[PDB]
Amino acid sequence: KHVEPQDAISPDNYMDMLGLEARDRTMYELVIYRKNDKDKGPWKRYDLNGRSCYLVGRELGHTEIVVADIGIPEETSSKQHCVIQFRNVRGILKCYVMDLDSSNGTCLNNVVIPGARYIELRSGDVLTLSEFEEDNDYELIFMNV
């Protein structure tokens, strides 16, 4: 149900406008961990700099068509579950999640977020793809650099 806000911008484009060389820029990523084995490292890492918005959704993949930028092998997640959205909010780069009215819900640090509304993200914030912890096999954590 998602269309980008008028102030949407990618971190790369934002940082370009300020004239910062790559070494002097804030890098954003989504670090994914498998809940059972976090003492083995990140399952996956996604760069979040090239785009202003990223679709998170189910990707089981043993015949199902791929739609989501970021695919999570979680049966209980929706195919278009939540979106990570960067905005230039009156001069400061800010990142938000929105739950796209998914069946099971989305949690930020184990607290259910309301649907159809942008919730501001902070570095370290742990996204999980259900209201209920038992349903979750993966943790998607938003990081600055």
Side-chain angles (χ1 to χ4, degrees):
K1 345 196 97 291
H2 180 263
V3 18
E4 285 190 280
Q6 69 152 297
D7 56 12
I9 193 163
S10 64
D12 280 0
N13 282 168
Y14 189 86
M15 302 283 157
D16 280 353
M17 285 181 157
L18 296 170
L20 298 178
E21 53 182 357
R23 73 186 79 179
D24 294 312
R25 340 225 293 197
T26 299
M27 306 286 280
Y28 301 89
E29 57 192 40
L30 196 66
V31 191
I32 306 163
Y33 295 90
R34 203 181 291 185
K35 255 193 152 95
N36 259 5
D37 39 292
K38 299 180 221 181
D39 290 27
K40 295 177 188 166
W43 181 72
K44 271 186 185 192
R45 289 209 282 172
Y46 284 87
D47 185 303
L48 295 181
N49 294 284
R51 297 178 165 270
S52 64
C53 122
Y54 294 88
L55 224 200
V56 172
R58 187 207 308 127
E59 270 182 54
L60 304 159
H62 246 166
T63 178
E64 263 298 286
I65 191 151
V66 183
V67 158
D69 289 304
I70 304 171
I72 298 306
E74 210 158 283
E75 317 173 309
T76 132
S77 70
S78 302
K79 54 183 86 179
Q80 297 188 57
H81 207 274
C82 71
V83 174
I84 281 111
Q85 178 70 63
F86 289 95
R87 306 162 58 195
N88 181 350
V89 184
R90 306 181 80 246
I92 121 102
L93 218 207
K94 288 177 166 156
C95 193
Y96 300 85
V97 247
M98 174 170 155
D99 180 77
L100 299 177
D101 288 340
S102 64
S103 291
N104 286 320
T106 318
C107 284
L108 182 50
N109 302 323
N110 276 326
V111 188
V112 201
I113 71 160
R117 182 171 85 88
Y118 284 117
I119 313 296
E120 194 177 350
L121 284 171
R122 219 209 314 244
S123 181
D125 277 351
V126 180
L127 301 165
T128 51
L129 264 43
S130 177
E131 278 190 85
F132 315 106
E133 200 177 334
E134 61 177 293
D135 293 352
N136 298 133
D137 275 326
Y138 299 89
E139 288 181 320
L140 337 185
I141 139 149
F142 173 75
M143 290 305 288
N144 283 212
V145 309

